Design a protein around this nucleic acid. Structure first.
Ligand SMILES: [Mg+2]
Ligand SMILES: [Mg+2]
Ligand SMILES: [Mg+2]
Ligand SMILES: [Mg+2]
Ligand SMILES: [Mg+2]
Ligand SMILES: [Mg+2]
Ligand SMILES: [Mg+2]
Ligand SMILES: [Mg+2]
Ligand SMILES: [Mg+2]
Ligand SMILES: [Mg+2]
Ligand SMILES: [Mg+2]
Ligand SMILES: [Mg+2]
Ligand SMILES: [Mg+2]
Ligand SMILES: [Mg+2]
Ligand SMILES: [Mg+2]
Ligand SMILES: [Mg+2]
Ligand SMILES: [Mg+2]
Ligand SMILES: [Mg+2]
Ligand SMILES: [Mg+2]
Ligand SMILES: [Mg+2]
Ligand SMILES: [Mg+2]
Ligand SMILES: [Mg+2]
Ligand SMILES: [Mg+2]
Ligand SMILES: [Mg+2]
Ligand SMILES: [Mg+2]
Ligand SMILES: [Mg+2]
Ligand SMILES: [Mg+2]
Ligand SMILES: [Mg+2]
Ligand SMILES: [Mg+2]
Ligand SMILES: [Mg+2]
Ligand SMILES: [Mg+2]
Ligand SMILES: [Mg+2]
Ligand SMILES: [Mg+2]
Ligand SMILES: [Mg+2]
Ligand SMILES: [Mg+2]
Ligand SMILES: [Mg+2]
Ligand SMILES: [Mg+2]
Ligand SMILES: [Mg+2]
Ligand SMILES: [Mg+2]
Ligand SMILES: [Mg+2]
Ligand SMILES: [Mg+2]
Ligand SMILES: [Mg+2]
Ligand SMILES: [Mg+2]
Ligand SMILES: [Mg+2]
Ligand SMILES: [Mg+2]
Ligand SMILES: [Mg+2]
Ligand SMILES: [Mg+2]
Ligand SMILES: [Mg+2]
Ligand SMILES: [Mg+2]
Ligand SMILES: [Mg+2]
Ligand SMILES: [Mg+2]
Ligand SMILES: [Mg+2]
Ligand SMILES: [Mg+2]
Ligand SMILES: [Mg+2]
Ligand SMILES: [Mg+2]
Ligand SMILES: [Mg+2]
Ligand SMILES: [Mg+2]
Ligand SMILES: [Mg+2]
Ligand SMILES: [Mg+2]
Ligand SMILES: [Mg+2]
Ligand SMILES: [Mg+2]
Ligand SMILES: [Mg+2]
Ligand SMILES: [Mg+2]
Ligand SMILES: [Mg+2]
Ligand SMILES: [Mg+2]
Ligand SMILES: [Mg+2]
Ligand SMILES: [Mg+2]
Ligand SMILES: [Mg+2]
Ligand SMILES: [Mg+2]
Ligand SMILES: [Mg+2]
Ligand SMILES: [Mg+2]
Ligand SMILES: [Mg+2]
Ligand SMILES: [Mg+2]
Lengths: 232, 195
RNA sequence: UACCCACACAUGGGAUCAAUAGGAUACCAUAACGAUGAAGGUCGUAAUAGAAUACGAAAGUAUUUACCUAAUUAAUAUAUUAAUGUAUUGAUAACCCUUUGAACUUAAGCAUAUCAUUAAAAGGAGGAAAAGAAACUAACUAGGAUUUCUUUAGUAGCAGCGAGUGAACAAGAAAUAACCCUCCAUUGUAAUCCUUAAUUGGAGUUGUAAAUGGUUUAUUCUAUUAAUUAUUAUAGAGAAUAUAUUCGUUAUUAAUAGAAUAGAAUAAUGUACUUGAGUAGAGCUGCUUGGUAGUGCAGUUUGAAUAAAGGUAGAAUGAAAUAUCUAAGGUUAAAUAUAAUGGUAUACCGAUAGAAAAUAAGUACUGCGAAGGAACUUGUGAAAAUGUGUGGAGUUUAGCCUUAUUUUUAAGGACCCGUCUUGAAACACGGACCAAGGAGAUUAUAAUUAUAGCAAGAUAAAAAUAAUCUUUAUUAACUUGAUUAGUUAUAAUUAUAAGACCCGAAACACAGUGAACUAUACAUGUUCUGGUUGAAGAUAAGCAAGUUUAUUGGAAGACCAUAAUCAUUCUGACGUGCAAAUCGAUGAUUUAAGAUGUGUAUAGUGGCGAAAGACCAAUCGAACUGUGUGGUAGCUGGUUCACAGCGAAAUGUCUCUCAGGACAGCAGUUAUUAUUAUAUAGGACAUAGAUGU
RNA sequence: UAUUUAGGUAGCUGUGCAAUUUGUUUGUAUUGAAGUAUAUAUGUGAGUAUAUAUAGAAGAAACAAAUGAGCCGAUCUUGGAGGCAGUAACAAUAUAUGUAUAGAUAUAGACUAGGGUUUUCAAUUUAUUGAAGUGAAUCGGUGUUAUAUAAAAACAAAAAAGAUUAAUAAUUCUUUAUUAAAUUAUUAUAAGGUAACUUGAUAAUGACAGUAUAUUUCAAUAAAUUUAAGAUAAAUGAAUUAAAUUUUUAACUAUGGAUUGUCAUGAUAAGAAAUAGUUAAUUAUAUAUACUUGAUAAAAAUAAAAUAAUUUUAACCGUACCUAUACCGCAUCAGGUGUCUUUGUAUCAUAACAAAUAUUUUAAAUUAAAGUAAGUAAGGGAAUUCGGCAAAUUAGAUCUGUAACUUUGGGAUAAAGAUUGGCUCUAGCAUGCUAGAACUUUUACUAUGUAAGGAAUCUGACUGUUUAUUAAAAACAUAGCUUUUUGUAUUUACAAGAAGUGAAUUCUGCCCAGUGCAUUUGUUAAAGUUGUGUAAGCGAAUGUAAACGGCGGGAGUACUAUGACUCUCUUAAGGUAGCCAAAUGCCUCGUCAUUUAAUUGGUGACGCGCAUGAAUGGAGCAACGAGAUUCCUACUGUCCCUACUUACAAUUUUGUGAAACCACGAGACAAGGGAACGGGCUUGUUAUUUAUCAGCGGGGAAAGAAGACCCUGUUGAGCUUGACUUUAGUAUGUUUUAAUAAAUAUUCGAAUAUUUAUUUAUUAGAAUAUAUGGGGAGUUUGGCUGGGGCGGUACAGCUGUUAAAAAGUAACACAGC
């Protein structure tokens, strides 16, 4: 046969990988004050970024919900908690919304980068100095304290309301996000290109649930499912 | 081939004359924290006694009485008709491969050993060999100090065969302070595990 | 007038015969490149210059040497004080030493095996290279470093024990040669070593030690230049001119360079007790060899003794006697193998032959590229195919055989050759016509027949002036044992292996070139004109929380045309075409998921794809160029002179056998011998019998 | 002394002729060798010898030797030359005197890619030879970069006229300018305005989408005037052509204190109108507003300034010519190839015609047939045909009028009617547009351009794309719906990978026995230790069908008939909601109705459905379609049944001048036998213009291509998998792993194992064993046979008959083991 589509797409990512910003905030020993300068828009991502200014140095950050040009925010380990400020994790009471959490201390940020997605805090445990967070995916993860984070819900709202009612709307989405579009179903192909292909009618003939035990080039279909079907 | 990009070649800078000396400092610093924390064998632990800084000066002031001839003196010594005129002169030997012949034939009377040598295996057997032939021995710090007598750069070992009559009493003063540091406590030096 | 025949004279073409500043094979000598700038390329120089050929601004006849090119104001390293000095880099197409490493093919299939310790590919040196002074061979009355030839030997042995593959000692020769470091080298003295005009500056005791004179004379050998040679002859090898002369041959000298031997003279002579460790060997694992249960090598784990010691002795382990040697550091001549370059010879070819090339030939010309690659000598003037003149027949019959002076007619006979085939003139295949070329030859090993030399023995083995066969005497072995005249050569036939009588596949592996056509992503530019319809938003006038009427406004993957683009129908035209996909009418299409120039990225078990197995230079269900390669074919086609003697089978058995093989039968050739005529017979008669149509 | 023997395919043996070279012996030739062409003799035959003509330098015989040693064929190799045949196929403007007067066809001109002397002139006849010709401080390259080799169209110091040459000209010459660098002469270091700002008095940028509307800058039209030109038998308030001269708004400042604008949306107590003033007005590739987006629309080199003057100061390379008869397709090829400019009439345009510019020389004709195009047709109107294939009808613009259905937007320009010229006026205001009226005629969008209409069924939602060269579609895509994996992403779950169906509306039933997938507690290798013990995986349990898939049969029971109801084999469950002789129904041209004079067609109903059925999706049509099918109206040479006219090829002449094919073809037939369909063989019947010309398609089983269909070969290749043998990747053991101290467990003071802490190590791997493993790699997949396949084994043994009185003998023949 020939090399299929999945392996040929990953080696096309090594010839020209996709490029993004990775915005991080600095670290400062005591509480300082900074000003918001302007709001911009990037090519790949939907959430707008913000340029703040600490000690006559301009950095880049993800914009929170209510933010206007010229406003003042504070950064430090013991800043007061309000909209757009960045404090330590232990100060916030249970029930609020944070949107950039570093895994360890003195890191930029790891969790909650996209627009419209936020996390919640559920508790504090004074023994061993740990707090449990509620991830946007729905899983409870235990975080160590003394990491610092930003208070508020991120901007850009709910983008998934109105559909791509035309085909032309989805053309410019996948082109900016560097994905392959359109896609051909694997049953329509000839049996050289794909395992499911060929035949006299369009059907599969093999079970579509494939274990994870098998090697890398044999993985296709619903890989390693614990369940299949509508629940009710 | 196979749709993979061409291989990429990185660059390196050549090290500057400050950068070479800087990196060699962090190599010798790491070793000095290493060798102390582990336990070293007893045969190396005996090489820590330097006897003093001050008591070295009495022995080197003895050996400078007996220096060998220079190169230019050696040719003028052969310009004379008879090369051997008078008695045999008393000298000081300075070689490692020659001194262990003298101790094995029991000719020597006083041996000085430099503990400065790297690699260290060359002089590990010296204090035990003098013990079997009843020779007094001593340890000085640097091999540059022994080369200062024989007008050489570095010298590992140094020993005398005999001395003159006038410095006889000056020699017996040295051996008493040398023996109470090493040979009277030799059986303790084998047992001490450095840790 | 046309058609046919006979004769004579002229066109067309380059066959035959004769020549030759060209090739092919074998042997001998040489075995000389490059940072002091190589091999190769591009551009220029002639008084009147294009091809070829020679040469660099000193340029078409002992120095110079334009510009690229390892191409270098560099790179990887060492020494001295960022600068200076030293060494390496590129070319090869034969022989040599390492690394990596296939498949076609044979087994009548194929998978272990064979082709093969091969081809392709990479690294490293010299005129030769590699090897080389026993941790050997043997069982004798014992031999003695390496290399090469003969022989042992197609043997012992290895292997689906099938096809097939395959060594050594002893014996006869060519050529000969042995040595040096590693300790404590006379410690009455580093006595050594590099560099500088200079103990000048260093190195070195963690150990360095290194005697020196090229003057002269004589002899021999090799290579290159220059000179003299009778017309009798140390010269009859051969060329050139015309129908008796020269160059040379033969035989002698000189000059330059190189090598070897000998003599004379000049320089020079102390002391020296070293023996090889992460090695040898074990356990697991993979390759290699004839090596069989290591013959040799390597990865991982583990890892000794020091001459009171260690290794080896053709089934395995353990033990014992008897022999015989001492590993793990270094150098080495001769006998041997083969190109580029120059010579000498020959039972080789003689212009469709010999090299692709008798050389304006690796040239003209082709391909995007890797690459592919011809014709033409000088005299004589054959056949095929035509022209002119003279003579002759008839219009109902080409050519051939027999018999006839009615021979440009008459009577009889007579379908076109080669080939497979039970059977061909066949409506079975090949062949329009002439010339030249064109297919069972060579080698190794066996056997039979004819001939020659010697014969209980036979012989040109390598070399220089021994072995083998008769005859391994049998057997697995022990126990035992006389006997069919041979051996060396010359010639013909047959069998097996070599490209193997000649030409012919679809395929497989190794090493390389292409995105100028066409596909996708990224960056940067350019992209004619007119109409139709009427969503949000906004304003007024009426009726009375709102609700009718009229304007303004100009959204949409909305509607329609020109220029530009595509390809539904006529199954129109054309169909040795205008054209290896075109032309005409009719149709579909419009601000976008469009069209298009240039630049960068993607390569053949790989890429790109709104998916038809479509496209990747007129080629795609695995592109193109060179090599292994004269790949294998139980299958089609062809196979060259006369006469004479003799003359078949299409049947039985076995076979992964049914389009093929082997054994038996039928045939031919040669040979020896007579009561095996006191004998035989696809017969008859007399006698004795078998049988179940 | 053959009175005896003599044919012969495959095949075996003997005696002889031809060619090239080698050793020895004998001999020929310039009064003429070898070769070649005609005769004669001789030999049974391969062959030999001599004679005559031509030519000009070497060749023959005997005894022995070495082989590249004798052609009719191979769709044999190379060269030369025939028939068909002067045949097919192409080219062919007028003048009695001319460097002119006319006719005819074609839009034309500049930069780049490609070509390389084709440019110009002279001499000799789209040729040959020989000279001459390309001039740069301001026109291109050389410079910067596109997130470790990139731009002659992106960015960047600066010029234009007017003339000269046989050919160069933003380059030569004249006139007026501009940039940069080096040397000279001179010098302000600040004033003024309340403010916006003015004058020598630094620190700025290169630099960035698309569409719509409003400005009418230029330019162009139109008018007037002034010089000039060309024509008409005549006539005309003075026609036609050429050149030039002319035809207030936006920001900001000071007073002011509440209104005001645009074609549209508005602006203002963060100060409107009205005044006074300071800056500018970007030249159509511009300015100001508005609109569409899960698309917001590149990089880097690059900076200073006042006035006058000077210069053997500004380097290197290309500058001719062609835009299709000077490129690519083997060519002087009806094909293909980036960008720009181009005059006049043309009441929406389009189409068409004319300007401008470039090329071009001489056969015949009222007459063939059959062709390739263009026209017309009395009466009938689809009767032709698989089918209205081809042609015909309709059409622009103004006014009335507009249905069923619906996803409420559409359907719709639905359908159906009426009007249209020319001239003379009247009436509106926006001044070149629109209504009405009178007069008149062989009646008016129609030269060119320009929708036939209606009623139903199947299938796809729509715009879109695809087999370059026989398939444009019902195939692919798409939004919409659903399932699954990942919390250690250069990117961070509204994100990143993997799959199925296919807009909206309405629905999505039952089964986990089989195969897969996930989760959790009997069998099984090696290495190590005195000895012993310990792996994953397989097996078992529990979930899962918008995972692969599946969804029965028989008997009685209420005048006949049927079975609501009952009984019964088993299984994982026994096809529910729906739908149909449908693109899915063999019997089959099913049964009934309707459409027609007549129907295997179409539509509506029926269902024990060979073999319908639910995201392998079921049911359904509003809008859309060069998709497939049937019927009405109009229309017509498709037909009844054909007829007439013109052009181009053809028939006739001159010039250039081929190919396929060819065993022999010299006249053709009836029957016979034959390899079972003769041009030739055997018996019969027969043609003939002095040797022709133009047609036609009965035959030569006519020509193209070593048949693609079928079979054989111990010949191949692409593809799949529960075929045979293995392998990359990956999972799990054992051994190697820095030291130290302590705790705990298991075995007997000791040996193992587990776990914690510190820093003194920490490049991150190596050697073996078991399992998984069509993601890959090699190769195989018998024979006989009334063709092969399916069926049987007549493929090994035994008995009786076939089998014909010794022995021997066939059939997918008989009866059996
Ligand atoms: Mg398909
Ligand atoms: Mg596959
Ligand atoms: Mg489907
Ligand atoms: Mg071969
Ligand atoms: Mg085989
Ligand atoms: Mg074979
Ligand atoms: Mg085979
Ligand atoms: Mg091998
Ligand atoms: Mg040699
Ligand atoms: Mg050597
Ligand atoms: Mg071998
Ligand atoms: Mg020494
Ligand atoms: Mg002479
Ligand atoms: Mg030894
Ligand atoms: Mg010849
Ligand atoms: Mg030749
Ligand atoms: Mg006859
Ligand atoms: Mg036959
Ligand atoms: Mg026939
Ligand atoms: Mg035939
Ligand atoms: Mg033929
Ligand atoms: Mg011949
Ligand atoms: Mg071949
Ligand atoms: Mg390859
Ligand atoms: Mg549209
Ligand atoms: Mg056609
Ligand atoms: Mg390549
Ligand atoms: Mg297909
Ligand atoms: Mg192609
Ligand atoms: Mg006979
Ligand atoms: Mg045959
Ligand atoms: Mg036989
Ligand atoms: Mg009888
Ligand atoms: Mg005969
Ligand atoms: Mg021959
Ligand atoms: Mg011939
Ligand atoms: Mg023949
Ligand atoms: Mg020919
Ligand atoms: Mg013509
Ligand atoms: Mg010319
Ligand atoms: Mg010009
Ligand atoms: Mg000019
Ligand atoms: Mg020019
Ligand atoms: Mg020009
Ligand atoms: Mg062009
Ligand atoms: Mg053309
Ligand atoms: Mg006519
Ligand atoms: Mg009519
Ligand atoms: Mg009529
Ligand atoms: Mg009909
Ligand atoms: Mg009919
Ligand atoms: Mg039609
Ligand atoms: Mg009117
Ligand atoms: Mg569609
Ligand atoms: Mg097509
Ligand atoms: Mg279409
Ligand atoms: Mg088509
Ligand atoms: Mg589809
Ligand atoms: Mg749906
Ligand atoms: Mg299950
Ligand atoms: Mg369920
Ligand atoms: Mg039902
Ligand atoms: Mg239906
Ligand atoms: Mg009917
Ligand atoms: Mg004509
Ligand atoms: Mg007949
Ligand atoms: Mg018949
Ligand atoms: Mg005719
Ligand atoms: Mg055939
Ligand atoms: Mg067979
Ligand atoms: Mg195969
Ligand atoms: Mg396979
Ligand atoms: Mg068969």
């Amino acid at each position: 046969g020939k090399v299929t589509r999945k392996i040929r797409e990953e080696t096309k990512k090594l010839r020209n990988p996709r490029k993004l910003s990775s915005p991080k905030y600095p670290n400062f020993p005591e509480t300082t004050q900074g000003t918001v300068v302007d709001l911009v828009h990037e090519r790949g991502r939907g959430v707008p970024l913000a340029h703040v200014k600490f000690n006559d140095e301009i950095y880049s950050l993800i914009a929170t919900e209510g933010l206007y040009t010229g406003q003042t925010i504070f950064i430090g380990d013991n800043a007061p908690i309000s909209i757009g400020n960045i404090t330590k994790l232990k100060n916030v009471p249970g029930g609020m919304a944070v949107h950039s959490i570093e895994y360890d201390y003195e890191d930029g940020g790891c969790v909650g980068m996209t627009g419209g997605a936020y996390s919640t805090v559920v508790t504090h445990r004074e023994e061993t100095n740990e707090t449990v967070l509620g991830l946007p995916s729905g899983q409870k993860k235990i975080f160590s304290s003394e990491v610092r984070c930003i208070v508020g819900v991120p901007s850009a709202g709910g983008i998934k309301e109105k559909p791509f009612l035309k085909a032309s709307v989805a053309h410019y989405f996948n082109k900016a996000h560097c994905k392959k579009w359109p896609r051909v179903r694997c049953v329509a192909m000839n049996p050289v290109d794909h395992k499911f292909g060929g035949g006299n009618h369009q059907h599969v003939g093999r079970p579509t649930t494939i274990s994870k035990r098998r090697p890398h080039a044999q993985l296709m279909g619903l890989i390693g499912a614990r369940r299949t079907g509508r629940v009710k | 081939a196979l749709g993979k990009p061409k291989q990429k070649k990185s660059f390196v800078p050549k090290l500057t004359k400050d950068q070479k000396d800087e990196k060699e400092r962090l190599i010798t610093k790491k070793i000095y924290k290493l060798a102390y924390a582990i336990k070293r064998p007893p045969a190396i632990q005996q090489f820590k006694t330097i006897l003093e800084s001050e008591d070295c000066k009495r022995a080197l002031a003895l050996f400078s009485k007996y220096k060998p001839e220079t190169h230019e003196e050696r040719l003028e010594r052969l310009k004379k008709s008879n090369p051997q005129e008078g008695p045999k002169p008393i000298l000081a030997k300075q070689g490692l491969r020659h001194v262990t012949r003298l101790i094995e034939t029991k000719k020597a009377k006083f041996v000085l050993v430099a503990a400065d040598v790297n690699p260290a295996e060359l002089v590990l057997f010296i204090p035990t060999l003098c013990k079997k032939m009843n020779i007094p021995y001593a340890i000085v710090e640097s091999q540059n100090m022994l080369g200062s007598v024989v007008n050489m750069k570095k010298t590992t070992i140094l020993a005398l065969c005999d001395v003159k009559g006038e410095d006889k009493k000056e020699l017996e003063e040295i051996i008493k302070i040398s023996n109470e540091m090493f040979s009277e406590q030799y059986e303790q030096h084998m047992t001490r595990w450095g840790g």
